[PDB]
């Protein structure tokens with residue numbers, strides 16, 4: 001795997017991924033609801049024209065995050081075995097320099113990895129399900145499947161990924177970690 005940093009657009013969010021090769025397909029970030037950085041990253045107001053599905057029916061991001069934390073406490077083991085809320089803020093994808101929205105969602109566990117993920121709906125079914133429910137971008141970076149039907153999780157050839165294009169998944173993993181290390185923004189990790 002790898003750890004990588006995403007800068008807040010307006011603070012670094014460290015993610016753990018077993019698919020660093022898919023970085024050019026990371027279209028949003030998800031933090032555990034209990035993640036220490038959430039309160040820091042919560043915007044004062046919603047952006048104009050925000051998708052209502054993203055707001056949990058809250059008037060402000062802070063109210064929505066408080067309500068989400070309170071609501072998920074009413075879940076039992078039954079429910080725990082896709083919902084979430086936009087923080088109103090963005091991080092920068094270090095591969096493409098693009099802003100990506102930051103969410104909390106209870107599908108991300110606080111005490112595992114770094115407690116935060118990069119979301120790649122094209123290639124992780126959990127992220128595909130979330131993106132379909134919320135109306136988030138789904139981008140193909142590994143050719144081999146059909147992202148309109150389901151996340152493609154297998155080996156393939158890199159597309160839409162600049163200096164990774166044409167590489168196999170194993171080659172792209174090595175190349176992107178090299179790039180992250182040269183930039184000081186990530187590391188390979190067991």
Ligand SMILES: CCOc1cccc2c1[B@-]1(O[C@@H]3[C@H](O1)[C@@H](COP(=O)([O-])[O-])O[C@H]3n1cnc3c(N)ncnc31)O[C@@H]2CN
Nearest residue numbers: 016017018019107108109112113115117118119120123124
């Ligand atoms: C397992 C397939 O993962 C895939 C497959 C395709 C693409 C990806 C990933 B992967 O999601 C992260 C991390 O890598 C992966 C680490 O899981 P393992 O090995 O520790 O069991 O799980 C996800 N993960 C990491 N931390 C957490 C967490 N705290 N809570 C929930 N899921 C997490 O990154 C990309 C975008 N999602």
